[PDB]
């Protein structure tokens, strides 16, 4: 029973991971072949850059604007920055924008989403000059709608690129996210790889490695079949016509009669998928963005993402059939995720109830083997020895994702104490249950027998696992003091943050 479950879990995980790796490699080869035929100084497609932010750090906003200006693309019609401001606090972002891009900043007193006339001519009259719009705080979706409307004013614009207010772009980042658009007529959205630049904490390193693995494996596998489930938030590209067509359903999203505020960068991708269009992700475009470093905010963000995913998978499954033979892989991936979550919960419950020492030892050993295999693959792909830290991602996964999943499932339907209860009470209950199961397992098996090989095997395995974990933690601590784990880009950001 337990051995069968462990075996099927291992085979399932390894098979899916190898299949995704092969698909990502094939997609990378296809994109490389497409790029190899790209003529030099290719600027056929006119692209407009749209940046949306809210209360962003002035240094991060300035660096993002400088990186946008550092782009080598010579076919940028204009830069559109939309800030949901209309307040004295938000004036700092406008002041920072002026020091980097022109002077003309407009602050209309109405929102295009809630206005009778949604055309951009009401608030803008010139398309040659870069424009910044300050509007009352409504949401990220409302800010993006204004940018989409402003970009659609110029007929010469053929595609748009969405960049977050705290995203650092490379010189060729814009070219790499717009070249695949012209490769195939059915391609309408392009996603770019996002890499975390700040890795000064143990959580930041794990988040960065998880992001890198996701982008280089799962998004590549999706792009091979042109069924990308979610485009890159900080870095992404869209076609003007599809955006103009699907802006109204995106801005008028209703789940059970109530407006949906969060879940950005997912409903738009789902709407693109419903039209049968193809989405291709490229790894050659690199965007740098920050990641949360606190457990509480990371858990909140993961709970929000889980809620968005739960809302979106229904429509994703309902629209996957429109791709014909395509979309079968996407449905299989969704079923994989659901069955994997359910299977993980079932094995956790079985381990807690049975508390058979042979079961936990085998589960720990197979999990360690999977982590070593994944870390070796990441190191081989990234050509960096720091990828071995992904073995520690299991702890943060267990302590964050499952409580976030439970919170998302329970709070989907139906003073400060009640508000605080909906965030971390479920996580605290999960932690207490895990601790209770652990202490019950330890107490129930309070015996020693060196004459039994099975008990000896379990003790040796658990001792080796603890020794390996301690060695990894010691190595990370040594690297942190030496500051070798810091990303190459982080050193400069620190340098001109100090020199400021």
């Amino acid at each position, epitope marked *: 029973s337990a051995v069968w479950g462990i075996s099927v879990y291992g085979v399932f995980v390894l098979g899916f991971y190898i299949a995704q790796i092969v698909f990502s490699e094939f997609n990378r080869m296809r994109l490389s072949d497409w790029i190899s035929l790209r003529p030099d100084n290719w600027n056929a497609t006119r692209v407009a850059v749209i940046i949306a932010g809210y209360r962003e750090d002035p240094f991060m906003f300035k660096k993002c604007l400088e990186s946008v200006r550092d782009s080598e693309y010579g076919n940028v019609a204009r830069l559109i920055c939309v800030i949901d401001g209309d307040e004295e606090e938000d004036l700092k972002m406008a002041e920072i924008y002026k020091q980097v891009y022109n002077d003309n900043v407009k602050k209309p007193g109405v929102v295009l989403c809630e206005s009778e006339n949604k055309n951009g001519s009401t608030i803008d009259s010139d398309v040659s000059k870069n424009i910044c719009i300050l509007q009352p705080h409504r949401g990220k979706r409302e800010s993006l709608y204004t940018g989409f409307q402003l970009a659609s004013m110029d007929p010469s614009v053929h595609a748009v690129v969405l960049i977050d207010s705290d995203t650092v772009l490379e010189k060729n980042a814009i070219l790499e996210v717009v070249y695949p658009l012209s490769c195939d007529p059915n391609i309408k959205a392009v996603a770019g790889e996002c890499k975390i630049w700040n890795t000064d904490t143990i959580l930041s390193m794990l988040v960065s490695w998880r992001y890198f693995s996701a982008f280089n494996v799962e998004r590549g596998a999706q792009s091979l079949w042109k069924t990308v489930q979610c485009v890159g938030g900080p870095l992404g590209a869209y076609t003007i016509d599809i955006i103009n067509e699907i802006k109204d359903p995106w801005i008028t999203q209703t789940f059970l009669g109530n407006k949906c505020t969060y879940g950005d960068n997912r409903r738009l991708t789902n709407e693109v998928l419903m039209r049968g269009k193809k989405i291709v992700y490229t790894p050659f475009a690199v965007g740098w963005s920050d990641s949360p470093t606190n457990v509480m905010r990371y858990i909140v963000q993961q709970t929000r993402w889980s809620k968005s995913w739960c809302r979106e998978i229904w429509y994703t499954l309902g629209s996957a059939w429109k791709h014909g033979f395509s979309g079968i892989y996407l449905a299989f991936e969704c079923m994989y995720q659901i069955m994997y979550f359910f299977l993980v919960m079932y094995l956790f419950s079985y381990i807690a109830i049975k508390a058979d*020492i*042979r079961a936990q030892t085998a589960t720990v050993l197979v999990s360690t083997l999977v982590t070593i295999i994944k870390s070796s693959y990441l190191a081989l792909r990234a050509k960096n020895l720091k990828a071995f830290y992904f073995v520690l991602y299991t702890y943060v996964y267990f302590f964050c994702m499952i409580p976030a999943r439970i919170t998302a499932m329970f709070t989907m339907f139906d003073a400060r104490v009640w508000l605080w209860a909906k965030q971390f009470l479920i996580t605290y209950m999960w932690w207490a249950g895990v601790l209770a199961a652990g202490v019950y397992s330890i107490v129930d098996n309070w*015996y*020693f*027998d060196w*004459a039994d*090989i099975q008990y000896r095997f379990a003790l040796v395995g658990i001792c080796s696992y603890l020794v390996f974990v301690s060695i990894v933690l010691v190595i990370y601590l040594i690297g942190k003091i030496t500051t070798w784990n810091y990303t190459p880009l982080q050193k400069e950001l620190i340098e001109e943050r100090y020199l400021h």
Partner: nanobody, 124 residues
Framework: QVQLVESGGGLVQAGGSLKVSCAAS????????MAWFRQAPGKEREFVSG???????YYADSVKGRFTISRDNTKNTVSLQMDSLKPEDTAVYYC??????????????????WGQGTQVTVSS
């Protein structure tokens, strides 16, 4: 601390079938390793068979296949199956329990607890 009490045991001809059982009462019977010993009238005590807490069965020489051992958890009882009886096995069987121990498991000293024992007689 657990109390070991045995049951059964009587005269039987060669090649017959006989059953011996040991009952233990304690906080957790599954955490104690059980073993069986013999005390021949001529020689000293010797190891016969034993079962560990992880359902591992150990058998001594010449009783590898003739004797089968098993334990039960819900009634906290352990039984030993007797097959192909031989008059040289005519002796008394003791039930022993152990919770903590080292590599050695075939000596009487390694087992802290012992039972009263039941006499088994085999006649040709």
């Amino acid at each position: 601390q657990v109390q070991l009490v045995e049951s059964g045991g009587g005269l039987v001809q060669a090649g017959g079938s006989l059953k011996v059982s040991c009952a233990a009462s304690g906080r957790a019977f599954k955490t104690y390793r059980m073993a069986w010993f013999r005390q021949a009238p001529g020689k000293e005590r010797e190891f016969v068979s034993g079962i560990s807490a992880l359902e591992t069965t150990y058998y001594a020489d010449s009783v590898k296949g003739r004797f089968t051992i098993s334990r039960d958890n819900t009634k906290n009882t352990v039984s030993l199956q007797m097959d192909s009886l031989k008059p040289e096995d005519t002796a008394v069987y003791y039930c022993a329990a152990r919770r903590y121990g080292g590599t050695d498991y075939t000596t009487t000293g390694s087992y802290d607890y012992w039972g009263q024992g039941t006499q088994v007689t085999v006649s040709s």
